[PDB]
Design a protein around this ligand. Sequence first.
Ligand SMILES: CCOc1ccc(-c2nc3ccc(-c4nc5ccc(N6CCN(C)CC6)cc5[nH]4)cc3[nH]2)cc1
Ligand SMILES: CCOc1ccc(-c2nc3ccc(-c4nc5ccc(N6CCN(C)CC6)cc5[nH]4)cc3[nH]2)cc1
Lengths: 572, 572
Amino acid sequence: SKLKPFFALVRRTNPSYGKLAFALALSVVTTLVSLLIPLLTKQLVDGFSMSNLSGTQIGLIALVFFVQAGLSAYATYALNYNGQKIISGLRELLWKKLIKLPVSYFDTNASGETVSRVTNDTMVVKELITTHISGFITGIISVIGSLTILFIMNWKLTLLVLVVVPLAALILVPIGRKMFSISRETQDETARFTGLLNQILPEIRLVKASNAEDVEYGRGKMGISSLFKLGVREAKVQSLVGPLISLVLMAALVAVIGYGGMQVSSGELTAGALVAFILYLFQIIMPMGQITTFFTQLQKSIGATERMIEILAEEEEDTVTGKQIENAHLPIQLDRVSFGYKPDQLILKEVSAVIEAGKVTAIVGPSGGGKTTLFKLLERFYSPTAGTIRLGDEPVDTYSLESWREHIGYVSQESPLMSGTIRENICYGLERDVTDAEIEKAAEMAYALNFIKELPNQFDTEVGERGIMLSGGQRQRIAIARALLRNPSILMLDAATSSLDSQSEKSVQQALEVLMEGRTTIVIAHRLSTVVDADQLLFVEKGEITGRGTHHELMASHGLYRDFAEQQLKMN
Amino acid sequence: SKLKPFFALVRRTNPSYGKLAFALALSVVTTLVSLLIPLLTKQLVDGFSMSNLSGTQIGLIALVFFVQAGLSAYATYALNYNGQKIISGLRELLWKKLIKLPVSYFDTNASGETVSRVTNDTMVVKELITTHISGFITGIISVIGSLTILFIMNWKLTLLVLVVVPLAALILVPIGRKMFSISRETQDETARFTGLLNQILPEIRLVKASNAEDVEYGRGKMGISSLFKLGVREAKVQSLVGPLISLVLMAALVAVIGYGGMQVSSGELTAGALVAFILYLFQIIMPMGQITTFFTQLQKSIGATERMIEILAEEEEDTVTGKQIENAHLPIQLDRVSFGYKPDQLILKEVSAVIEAGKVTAIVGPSGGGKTTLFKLLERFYSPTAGTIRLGDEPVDTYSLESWREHIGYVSQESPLMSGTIRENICYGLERDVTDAEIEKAAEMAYALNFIKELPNQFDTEVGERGIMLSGGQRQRIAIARALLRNPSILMLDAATSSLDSQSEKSVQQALEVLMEGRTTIVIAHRLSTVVDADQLLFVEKGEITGRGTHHELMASHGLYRDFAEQQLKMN
Ligand SMILES: CCOc1ccc(-c2nc3ccc(-c4nc5ccc(N6CCN(C)CC6)cc5[nH]4)cc3[nH]2)cc1
Ligand SMILES: CCOc1ccc(-c2nc3ccc(-c4nc5ccc(N6CCN(C)CC6)cc5[nH]4)cc3[nH]2)cc1
């Protein structure tokens, strides 16, 4: 019943079932031919009584070897190609799901663990499909057929000792596990010793200042003693593990082969059956390891597939709400907004506010308050539950969130870079308009073309995957240029202004304020450099908005103590 | 020639060569017995025509098996025990050298890599001593003896094809290396794809805000398409490999064993000696891996022993200079002090200053100047080259450096913890005076016992190996108490101030100042309280001392001169 999710997930890829089944059957046929090769060898050994049939049998054996090799090659190619196709389909589905998934999932669950899980589990499912299931089938067939053929050919005597010998496994396995436990304990002790040394060494200045180095040496000696004692123990235990194992193996070996040799001398039904027996043992041994590896890999892959389905079970909506955007130019209202991330916690409580259209607005939050939550709420990445973020009559729930997003410009603190060139990084918002060649001209409108006039190149200017040769000063100018290029209708900022100092700050701020003067603006940062240019100021504390009006003149009557205390912490 | 350093290093630990040589000889004897065993098996197989001799030979074989097991067990125990003793000696020598190595070496070269080259190279040398040398000797003996015995047993026919077949290594090994190369290329591609995804995902806020889900999905699809192409190429290359490896190995096995059985059946002498031949094949194939592993580990160990000797090559001293300390109370003067880390750079140039005795002196330095160099120079951690830090009418080495350090208390920025209990913290000053039982009293006047008045425990007060349950203020207070306990004669601080806050800062400053009440004090911090807490002031700039006199005059003049820039940095 646990394989049903795996079958459904593989079905999601629309596999070529016929080709996979044909490849598996061809692998079975190859295993059956490898089950036949030793019989031909036995026939050759028995037929050495004359020389021409020896040559004919050698030719037949070579032909069977080549046929087996070719059949196995084609089966492996079909298996691997189908596995790669299934993995490509699975990765396509997973990446389509991840990108469309709401930003809440990324913030509240993980960022790199998701990509890790995706890649690792796709690789595990590939290993289960292309190798381990066929490997298990081939191993089962090989073991069963070899045991049956040994029973038919060399009969009870030798095969019974062959399957009584695995009592040697009941002596090897506990011994091997004791070796593993002692090795793990020694490794842990070594880790403790190196941790002690790595703790002591950085404070060597303090050690020598106190002139207690000898004492530390003594401490070190104790560690070197401890390991030694444990090491000695390992030695003793290894002296009961190293030889004994070999002994048992050799004993088993001799026994088996010895009986074969004996049955050759006594005249029993064994002339070339001994050679066939050794070849069948060699075909027996490896499939045991293959089966064990398959069992462990299935134990891992069931959980991997469960994680796959857990990723593929989420949902998100982009245009489902509706499509009725026409102007997107109206005062925005927060009405009874009270919701955070989980309804139980209630990180937001009864937040209400008004913002006019075409006026710069500020959102000042404390260090650890609800400024980030309020930003994400206004930025429409969080689904409203109780309150209403309205544009009048609350149309935001009846038209596409993508229509909202196309009309919003956003750069908050860094927005570092999107892997590519400058033209693509300012062309990230091609809403099917292609934007012609306005881009660089708009950069001149954003005072960016004259800033990039040095021009290492235009289209080949590579920021690299790392993105480190450009400081934060140049990238934020590019971000502002892109924001004004896409759709200057409503713009929101965490005031990407930084340590750039007035020289760059003056230019970037004057450009921004002159361009988006006629359109709605929101600022959410802490600095007061933007609040003087913000027509309306709002303050947030304890998940509640307190303060409406012009500016610092009005917080002088409302936040003259609490807001002043946070600003005092800021002056530090 | 290259083994001489290894032999010398082993000799440094008194190897007790007799036991090691006896263990090696016993291993050789065990290998000879293992070579003997298949001949006894062949005797039993040939003699299996009547039952009693079969039982006698089985008993003899079992006795030889047990003798071999016991001899191998004792040889392994002796080898491992001698190796552990050698490693303990080497670790003791290395740790003594490390703890006695100069501080200047530690900061300029490495911190954790030094511990790595005491923990990992010792393990490598152990692997070479206990296992790989004996393993190589026993493998060479086994291979040569088995080839010789097979030559005297089957002569031209079987053993020539025996040797000729593993020339199929010239067919297998290139194929395996091509497999490894293709696997490495695929792994690199998947690593690049994982990096691309881990770069895309954290920018999901910008990705959705700009509404480029389709673009990012397309880029991910291109990445997984490249991965699919790599997988298809790997699939083809593996399909032209796996069946080839199986075919070559099975053709080898069939040729050898079928020829053996063919000789057995024909009448050509082989009787039941095919059993001995198979056992000799099993004793031949195993030690090849041991020989190859020995060669690779010999390369690694001959690389690591040089690092061992280089660590052990360096030297340092603490009392060779002399022993001429009687008072250690005299004004401190700098006389044309010019030395840094390397004579070529000359980071210090003719630094000179006058410091009285019992007068607190403050040092002011810039962010990246030479304040740290002079700070470490005053502690005598760096060897004078040209200039002289004269204390004692010029001779500063007439007395032992340990004696100079003994009269010194030191805590600069953190001085985090010496892991264990507060007993170690207060007893690090146990310079043969044991302090009787006055440590708690010493804590009492030093204003530490009332700080620990909550008393979780007195002697069992534990801080943990990590040392995170106490704050910076408390550990700095304990450091001050230790400094006042050892020898409150001459003191230098960097005024460790991290999280004490005004109350604790003033408390520790007043207690510390009361405690010396007439002993020399040195301060090198940047805080203005620390610099007003000093009768005489200094200033460091460009590796030169510029400024002498009283606090107010210097602070007013230096700020007038150029120190106002550093001050402006301070208010920031
Ligand atoms: C399914 C049942 O059938 C079986 C078929 C084969 C084996 C079997 N597979 C083996 C693989 C390796 C060894 C083996 N590896 C060895 C390594 C070293 C030595 N030495 C060399 C030197 N030392 C000191 C003494 C012996 C013997 C060794 N014998 C024995 C083995 N016996 C067991 C059961
Ligand atoms: C000359 C010195 O003497 C030698 C004697 C033996 C070997 C030798 N050592 C071997 C170890 C493993 C294998 C082997 N590994 C296999 C893996 C798979 C299969 N299969 C299982 C299913 N497939 C499809 C068919 C056969 C057979 C296999 N046979 C062959 C081997 N031949 C080498 C030199």
